[PDB]
């Protein structure tokens, strides 16, 4: 059948793996490795365990060690005595106990080994607000938001039934929006409010209550709505817990929709998403046209490029690139979604004259883009062809989590040209053979550079042998070397070793 | 302190071309040999035919096909002086066969035909094209448009430009002073008296200037108002240098150019060898402690910058302010030292002032003025982003003396262990669960082998145990990497009793 379908693959607890579908075309992937959890805006409830008014805060403990360090000023009202009198209202010993018991939000994980940074103040976001139910004092709207918009938005934003001693925000996506679909977001968040208090009475000690950074809960608090047909599980360990959270986030309805799979094809080749999450894996993306898209990663921007197809029987060039950068704007918004990209991005259509073309493609890319539930902003087309846009960094991308750094190459994608570098090489040993007091000169280096230096420049090492005399040169061939790695070593008159010449990599390792 | 030429001309392979104000380094070109182009040589060739029905003539400039001089191509100094225009002309009345011509080259050979030649000579600087020939030549590129256009038709119109010449100015001319412009002219005039001395100095066909030479570009594009000595660490070269620069004029120069004679190599005597080593590092390092990172991408060029170590202190506004100001200074050399063309984009460090952020596009602004190049650039973008673009006057460094690393293919990463086994291990739990099927054969690099028959092992025991009656074989081998693999299945019946580490040469042999 074609249907919105959620499923989820739990088998190597090695990776657990998240899959969106519409239909047969994959829509976002999510992955988790074990380990190095982040533990930002979890909710735990958790016990004061020591006072102290000179750092005008309190050590809790939630069940984690060390307790984690919890200032006044982020003490909201509801944990003070009955009555309380302003003496400035500085002293801990005046405001709170030892043993009592508080609702906790992480604010700051983990910097140092110092307990983390804590807050009652809790925040809970989703796409288009930020619910804070426990500060009237803050509330507002986006910075981003502007012209009419504010207006609007904030004349659909007091038309709201908020309940009195919360304060809310509209966030950067929140814009256009309506005045019921901003109902539709805040039950949403009241809901996940009252099953956090549900569970606090619940039972009382230190334990989590909300687990922000986990897969499943991100991934049901920010897609599950009612067009999804069937969320499908095939680990039953953890389709218990599938449960636990979506009661936690206060939405017990959409349990039902929780099948689970036992059927013997491996859940994602069953439903056959298992090709398109290897799309995610690639480098050069085919589209749907013989055209293609390319995206590389650097230090801190991402860049994406379109190419065409091969020019076929002498076509429309114009309407050629303007179908190409539609199908790429279309693709490189879900390959954002398979690859958990985070930072900015950039992205080389193709040049296209008319201002009609442009403004058709940057809209395709925002349609395209506009369910992503990631904060994502974008500019226009620019003087030279490149649109700049961002995105906001949850996770961990799957270069992050699932790729590590070149061996060879450490990083760039290139290596030196072997006569290139075999120079660069010759120079920095003559380099070192005219410094006084230099007995010998070692030169461990990949098998084919030792066979450059040694046969077509042969002339030239002899030729600094006999410049700076007595300078033995010494060029090691070494298999444990590959074409952009050398070692190039002085040695001290009377540090000299009688030591052979296969021998010195050996000997040599050490240094290294 | 004195800015110099040095040229390092003693290895075969690489002539390397520094250009030095004092010790500091700020220019270079790489260039390796071979590979010569005639198009734009300008010879010295003797008419040899006629002929009316292409409205066209040959011409020995000196190579075996004679070259084909149109009509249209032929300046008026070469008319017979008793003529009447009466019509168009035909060349029977224009061009007699023996009559000695100054030629260029305009188009190279195409296959049976000869090379098309041209009377209108044209003399390329690197910022000005003079035309001796036509004055009906003239004016700006089409590639600068706006207050940058009539900045030039101001400082184009203040040069002393003879009668019967035309100018054309050009896109890298840009960013220059008056006083640059007039200097790249007047050697280009004294380039073409050059040029009539030696046509008249010899009858014949033989070859007066070489524009695509190694030498003669080093000096169009590097040899300049203030440049004092050429240091040169070869005669042969040195013999050379002195011939050229008598060719474009300058003959007077010659003395200049001195010779080195030292233990120490040359660039190791100017203490500059560091700098060009700066070159292919991918981090640079920063006045002040900081870095920039330049990273080539498909597409466009991407570098990043880092600010110091660690702030002692909370002026955080300043320390930002100032390694971005380093990083426009660091950039816009670097970009001459690699010749880096195309798009490049900079991430700048946040700097919360708008006067700031002019501050930094205008320092970079500054300082590719001194670049050959032209090099547009925008402003620092609502996402901390200076886009900006170069021109490509040559491949690159990283383009000629680099290739693809091999692990990746160009990545920069290459997939992890844990994230290659699962999949592999995936579609070996879809063959096995074929009808067809009896064994299943995973040929995986060593230490995928390793990880798939260790940590999952149990894993693979129930891909067995489930598929009741199949076999599950993942055999190492050392001759295959990173990366690569096989998952080969075996349909019922056709076994052999192959043993596990002989199965890779016999599927390989197949
Ligand atoms: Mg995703
Ligand atoms: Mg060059
Ligand atoms: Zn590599």
């Given at each position: 059948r074609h249907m919105k379908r959620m499923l989820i693959n739990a088998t190597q607890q090695e990776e657990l793996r998240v899959a969106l579908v519409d239909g047969q075309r994959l829509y976002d992937l999510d992955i988790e490795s074990p380990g190095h959890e982040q533990k930002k805006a979890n909710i735990y409830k958790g016990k004061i365990t020591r006072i102290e008014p000179s750092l005008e805060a309190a050590f809790?403990?939630?069940?984690?060690?060390?307790?984690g360090?919890?200032?006044?000023?982020?003490?909201?009202?509801?944990?003070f005595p009955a009555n309380y009198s302003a003496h400035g209202r500085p002293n801990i010993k005046d405001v709170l106990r030892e043993g009592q018991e508080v609702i906790v939000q992480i604010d700051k994980e983990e910097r140092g080994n110092k307990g983390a940074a804590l807050t009652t103040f809790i925040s809970l976001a989703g796409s288009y607000l930020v619910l804070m139910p426990n500060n009237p004092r803050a509330g507002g709207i986006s910075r981003r938001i502007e012209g009419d918009d504010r207006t609007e938005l904030k004349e659909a934003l007091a038309s709201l039934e908020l309940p009195e001693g919360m304060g809310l925000i509209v966030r950067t996506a929140g814009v256009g929006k309506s005045a019921?679909?901003?109902?539709?977001?805040?039950?949403?968040?009241?809901?996940?409010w009252e099953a956090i208090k549900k569970a606090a009475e619940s039972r009382p000690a230190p334990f989590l209550i909300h687990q922000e950074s986990n897969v499943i809960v991100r991934a049901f608090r920010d897609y599950l709505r009612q067009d999804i047909g069937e969320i499908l599980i095939d680990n039953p360990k953890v389709l218990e817990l599938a449960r636990q959270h979506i009661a936690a986030l206060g939405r017990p309805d959409f349990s039902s929709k929780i099948k689970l799979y036992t059927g013997e094809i491996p859940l994602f080749s069953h439903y056959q998403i298992e090709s398109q999450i290897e799309s995610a894996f690639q480098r050069e993306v085919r589209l749907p046209s013989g055209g293609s898209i390319v995206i590389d990663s650097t230090e801190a921007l991402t860049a994406i490029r379109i190419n065409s197809a091969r020019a076929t029987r002498g076509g429309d060039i114009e309407e050629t690139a303007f179908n190409t950068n539609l199908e790429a704007a279309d693709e490189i918004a879900r390959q954002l979604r398979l690859r958990?990209?985070?930072?900015?991005?950039?992205?080389?259509?193709?040049?296209?004259?008319?201002?009609?073309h442009?403004?058709?493609?940057?809209?395709r890319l925002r349609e395209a883009v506009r369910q992503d539930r990631a904060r994502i902003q974008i500019s226009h087309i620019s003087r030279f062809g490149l649109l700049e846009m961002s995105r906001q960094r949850l996770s961990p991308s799957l270069g992050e989590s699932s790729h590590h750094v070149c061996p060879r190459c450490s990083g760039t994608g290139?290596?030196?040209?072997?006569?290139?570098?075999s120079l660069s090489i010759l120079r920095?040993?003559?380099?070192?053979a005219l410094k006084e007091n230099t007995q010998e000169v070692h030169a461990i280096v990949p098998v084919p550079i030792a066979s450059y230096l040694l046969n077509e420049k042969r002339s030239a090492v002899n030729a600094i042998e006999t410049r700076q005399d007595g300078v033995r040169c010494v060029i090691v061939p070494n298999d444990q070397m590959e074409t952009p790695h050398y070692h190039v070593l002085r040695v001290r008159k009377g540090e000299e070793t009688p030591t052979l010449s296969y021998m010195l990599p050996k000997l040599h390792e050490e240094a290294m």
């Open positions: 809790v403990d939630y069940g984690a060690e060390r307790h360090f919890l200032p006044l000023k982020e003490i909201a009202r509801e944990y019921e679909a901003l109902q539709w977001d805040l039950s949403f968040r009241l809901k996940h958990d990209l985070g930072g900015l991005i950039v992205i080389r259509f193709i040049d296209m004259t008319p201002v009609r442009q403004r058709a493609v940057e809209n290139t290596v030196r040209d072997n006569e290139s570098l920095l040993i003559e380099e070192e």
